[PDB]
Amino acid sequence: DAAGLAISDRMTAQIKGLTQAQRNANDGISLAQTAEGALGEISNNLQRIRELAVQASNGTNTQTDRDALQAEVTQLQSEIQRVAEQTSFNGQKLLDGSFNGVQFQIGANAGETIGVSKIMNAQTASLGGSLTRTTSTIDATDLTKYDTAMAAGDLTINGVDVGKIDAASTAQERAAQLTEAINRVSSQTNVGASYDKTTGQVTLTSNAAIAVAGAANDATVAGWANNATTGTATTTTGINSLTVSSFTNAQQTITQIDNALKDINTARADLGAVQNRFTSTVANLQSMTENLSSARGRVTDADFASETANLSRAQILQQALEH
Known about the structure:
Layout (H helix, E strand, L loop, with lengths): L1 H55 L6 H24 L1 E2 L2 E2 L8 E4 L7 E4 L13 E10 L16 E2 L2 E2 L9 H14 L1 H4 L1 E6 L4 E6 L3 E4 L5 H4 L4 E4 L1 E6 L9 H75 L2
Antiparallel strand pairs: 1-2, 3-4, 5-9, 5-12, 6-7, 6-10, 8-9, 10-11
Helix pairs in contact: 1-2, 1-6
Subcellular location: Secreted; Bacterial flagellum
Function: Flagellin is the subunit protein which polymerizes to form the filaments of bacterial flagella.
Family: Belongs to the bacterial flagellin family.
């Protein structure tokens, strides 16, 4: 019975181990579905941003029109960021870049595992990857000569005149005025302005050096003094520094959002594959466990039959002998 004890004990280890492992694989499906659903909501939000970037590139837009589109973009970036930073399955974050992958015990024995691969950092500071362009930032508060009116020719961008600008009563108003006039010619100069009202900063953006010229040559009235190579080549990650404030900005946003969607798509593809792997694992474990338990059932049935038959036999023989 040495072999019988060894087999019975292994059958028990197998049945119980493979039964827990099917639970484990089912839990793996649920985590992946969760991560994939959440990425799906981010993708929706990304499409919305992209669509607003197309709309913002309308040649008939005022700055006020673009600022309204940017308000919605800002709302969307907030929602993408909280989904990416908050999403979890049973106490473990999935989309913040901290999911280094996990292995699932899907067999009875140590080391019989299936890995869920690391999941991308879908936070807005990371989503979509690299983006390098030329930027130049001022503060609205720098515009101390906001009262000094501008006549056409005072400020030019890449040799394109921004035109006349009336006297302002605040530095912040001149900031608004400069954003507006620069952005009017953005599609022609390849330079766009984003005026962040939360901070008061005006950022110029381009794919190349910015040629600032004109009659005024005073940063305190027209934001930037004359300089043929204005701006610095600068890199950020993700979509968080994206705006649709100008044609130039909105064109960058389209391109970068496309990069972000690609990243999401491939992450969702990975997660679909791992679900598939877990589902075929569950099918395998269910089949194996059913076979093993059926085999056990035949053994215990036979044991009961032999016990009953042996006990009966001993009594019937006893009777025969007592005659």
